[PDB]
């Protein structure tokens, strides 16, 4: 008699909230997708073990095309759950699935979970200072995406930071790295030459948020473009004008160039 | 030798992640702060009983002035947990505390949890479209702060949504309602006449996020300004131009008027 959208969190199976676990343990059927993001700290088995239910995984197509044929039909006579990495409604199009649920006469509920969108708080950058966000997508064929480049520009002009979700092709097991994302951004700089992303632009990389030992680094592109930030997933951030306290955290915690301390007011 | 920054999540004692609960249980000492925000759906006692540990509450002064004298000493020789509502380090002042830990030769780890900053995804508004964030503060005495008005203006100007955290007098335990916030914004409009917030402005109200039954309502100020959204906490959102999918969700799930489909898209 219900459908639950339950978030699994940032890194491993324990990133689920107690609410989400207690509820998932009591559902009759459990579905999940693992294409919107990457949980590099667990495995399907451990999750199934933690929840104590068989977890039927779905592909982007099963979801996007047959959600109402695969999941909804059961939600009518049973308690069904749909799991996702991080928060189920952040940087996905899952929200519209609630509309399908409604249109099918199924009540739906949402259980949140830690999201990279808020997790960036660990970088020491003020969350309220983040502007519009964007995704650095893989180029395909002769199509060259540049929108994400303009987002950075627009925010930087207001002194705001930019959060850059990195692309992903789960079926191919391809998880864009920050290094890759930086390369792509430099290329776009050649094209537009708007002085947005150069070798002297300060950036911050967060890898494996949620793990006890995430990788947090801040520095100039020229020096990080070649750095190894560990296994994915990675997120890239282009800070705006920094508050002194932010710079302090970047230098003290993310080992950034001690020079960023002398901010330009 | 270890300090754990553990987030308590959105609303009640079950909004902590399994990771945060287990880690908290294995800690020798447990501290908590409830001045950046509160956990409206639970009590200190319900949290203590869930953690199975005595929890010492610290004031703003305790943390901001004597964190190194109250919390860190015990960390140098034990496993200490510092709990906070939401997701740690989303609150501006938190990050600075990791530096203090370092200064004392103490290791600190962060255990994330759902933040309202990311939970707003349940409103159907695309997360990437959220711009700079602001807080609607209660005017007091000869001080009438209004920057939050300019934040809406700059965001909406760029087609971006604006998340407004509503003021909370933690000690006094008073919550600013969305209605109160709307009234304030209508007054700030009469003073700046910038056409940023009026009776015809479309807004979204999210109450008790995290709860299984939050209140998600969308509509024009003139219709919502005196509507009862239930118990706190309330979050107010002034969306920018809407993508049709966002609008369809607001109408179908948040009871928004069909009118927004042609006026705000
Ligand atoms: N633990 C983590 N560390 C760093 N980046 C992460 C991450 N989890 C997700 N991301 C980033 O976000 C992208 C997925 S976008 C979907 C986000 C998800 N709903 C959430 O709430 O987090 C990834 O490609 C990656 O760039």
Per-residue 3-state assignment (H helix, E strand, C coil) for chain B: CEEEEEECECCCHHHCEHHHHHHHHCCCEEEEECCCCCCCCCCHHHHHHHHCCCEEEECHHHHHHHHHHHCHHHHCCCEEEEEECECCCCCCCCCHHHHHHHHCCCEEEEECCCCHHHHHHHHCCCHHHECCCEEECCCECCECCCHHHHHHHHHHHCCCEEEEEECEECCCCEECCHHHHHHHHHHHHHHHCCCCCCCCCEEEEEECECECCCEEEEEEHHHHCCCCCCCCCEEEEECCCCCHHHHHHHHHHHCCCCCHHHHCC
Other C-beta atoms lying within 10 Å of the C-beta of residue B265:
13
Enumerate the residues of chain B whose CB falls inside 8 A of the CB of residue A253: 98-99, 102
Question: To which H or E segment does residue A203 belong?
Answer: strand A202-207
Enumerate the residues of chain B whose CB falls inside 8 A of the CB of residue A254: none
Nearest to B100 by CA among B135, B134, B65: B65
Mark yes or no for CB contact A16/B18 under 8 Å: yes
CA A46 to each of CA A29, A72, A150, B165: distance values in angstroms, whole numbers, following the listed order: 17, 26, 41, 37
- B3 forms beta bridges with B80, B108
Integer distance in angstroms from the first to the last C-alpha of chain B? Answer: 54
In whole angstroms, what is the distance from residue A69 CA to residue A76 CA? 12
Integer distance in angstroms from the first to the last C-alpha of chain A? Answer: 58
Contact in structure between A100 and B106 (CB atoms under 8 Å):
no
- Boundary residue ending a domain (A95, A114, A133): A114
> Do B174 and B103 lie in a common domain?
no
Method: X-ray
A92 lines ligand 1 (CB under 6 A): yes
What is the maximum alpha-carbon separation in chain B?
A: 63
> Do B257 and B129 lie in a common domain?
yes
Nearest CA in chain A to B211: A111
> Do A174 and A250 lie in a common domain?
yes
Enumerate the residues of chain A whose CB falls inside 8 A of the CB of residue B249: 95-96, 98-99
- Boundary residue ending a domain (A97, A114, A131): A114
Å resolution of this model? 2.3
CATH number of domain containing A191: 3.30.950.10
A185 contact partners, CB below 8 Å, separation of at least 6:
A136, A148, A149, A152, A197
Task: State the total domains in chain A.
Answer: 2
In whole angstroms, what is the distance from residue B54 CA to residue B48 CA? 6
Of B90, B245, B252, the CB nearest to A118: B90
Closest atom, ligand 1, to C-alpha of A165? 26
Edge-first strand order for the sheet with A79-84 is A55-58, A29-33, A79-84, A2-7, A108-111
Contact in structure between A198 and A149 (CB atoms under 8 Å):
no
The answer to whether the Cα torsion of A256, A258, A261, A264 is positive or negative is: negative
Kindly compute the dihedral angle of the four CA atoms of residues B46, B51, B57, B60, in this order, to the nearest 10 degrees.
-100
> Do B159 and B56 lie in a common domain?
no
The DSSP letter of residue A235 is E
Task: Quote the crossing angle between the two packed helices A178-192 and A147-158, to the nearest 10°.
Answer: 80
Q: Going by CA atoms, what residue is nearest to atom 23 of ligand 1?
A: A37
Contact in structure between A166 and A236 (CB atoms under 8 Å):
yes
Other C-beta atoms lying within 10 Å of the C-beta of residue B181:
23
Determine the distance separating the centroid of ligand 1 and the alpha carbon of A35, expressed in angstroms. Answer: 11
Contact in structure between B207 and B196 (CB atoms under 8 Å):
no
Mark yes or no for CB contact A7/B112 under 8 Å: no
> Do A64 and A119 lie in a common domain?
no
CATH number of domain containing A88: 3.40.1010.10
Is B161 known as a binding-site position?
no
A16 reaches B (C-beta below 8 A): yes
Contact in structure between A101 and A72 (CB atoms under 8 Å):
yes
> Do B85 and B151 lie in a common domain?
no
Of A14, A19, A210, the CB nearest to B22: A14
A136 lines ligand 1 (CB under 6 A): no
> Do B162 and B265 lie in a common domain?
yes
Interface of B with A in 93-132 (CB under 8 A): 94-96, 98-99, 102, 109-110, 112-115, 117-119, 121-122, 124, 127-132
> Do A105 and A138 lie in a common domain?
no
In whole angstroms, what is the distance from residue A44 CA to residue A223 CA? 36
Nearest to B180 by CA among B228, B218, B142: B228
Contact in structure between A148 and A181 (CB atoms under 8 Å):
no
Of A99, A248, A253, the CB nearest to B252: A99
> Do B80 and B193 lie in a common domain?
no
Nearest CA in chain A to B89: A121
Contact in structure between B220 and B202 (CB atoms under 8 Å):
yes
What is the maximum alpha-carbon separation in chain A?
A: 63
Burial of B55 (0-12, 13-18, 19+ CB in 10 A): middle
Enumerate the residues of chain A whose CB falls inside 8 A of the CB of residue B130: 132-133
> Do B142 and B235 lie in a common domain?
yes
> Do A63 and A36 lie in a common domain?
yes
- Boundary residue ending a domain (A56, A79, A114): A114
Q: How far is the alpha carbon of B228 from chain A, nearest alpha carbon, in Å? A: 21
Kindly compute the dihedral angle of the four CA atoms of residues A231, A236, A242, A247, in this order, to the nearest 10 degrees.
10
Tell me the residue range of the domain where A89 lies: 1-114
> Do B41 and B65 lie in a common domain?
yes
């Amino acid at each position: 008699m219900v459908l639950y959208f339950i978030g699994l969190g940032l890194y491993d199976e324990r990133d689920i909230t107690v609410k989400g676990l207690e509820i998932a343990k009591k559902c009759d059927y459990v579905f999940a997708e693992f294409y919107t993001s990457l949980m590099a700290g667990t495995t399907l088995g451990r999750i199934q073990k933690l929840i104590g239910k068989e977890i039927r995984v779905l592909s982007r197509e099963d979801v996007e095309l047959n959600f109402e044929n695969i999941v909804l039909p059961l939600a009518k006579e049973n308690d069904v759950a749909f799991l996702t990495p991080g928060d189920p409604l952040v940087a996905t199009t899952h929200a519209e699935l609630r509309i399908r649920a409604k249109r099918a006469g199924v009540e739906s509920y949402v259980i949140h979970a830690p999201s990279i969108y808020s997790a960036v708080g660990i970088t020491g950058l003020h969350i309220y200072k983040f502007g519009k966000s964007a995704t650095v997508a893989y180029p395909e064929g002769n199509w060259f995406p540049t929108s994400y480049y303009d987002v950075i520009k627009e925010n930087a002009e207001r002194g705001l930071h930019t959060l850059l979700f990195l692309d992903i092709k789960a079926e191919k097991r391809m998880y864009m790295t920050a290094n890759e994302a930086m390369e792509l951004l430099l290329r776009v700089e050649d094209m537009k030459k708007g002085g947005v992303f150069t070798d002297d632009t300060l950036v911050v990389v967060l890898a494996r948020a949620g793990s006890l030992n995430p990788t947090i680094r801040a520095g100039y592109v020229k020096d990080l473009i070649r750095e190894d930030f560990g296994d994915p997933p990675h997120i890239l951030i282009v800070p705006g004008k920094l508050h002194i306290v932010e710079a302090e955290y970047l230098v003290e915690i993310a080992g950034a160039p001690r020079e960023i301390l002398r901010v330009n007011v």
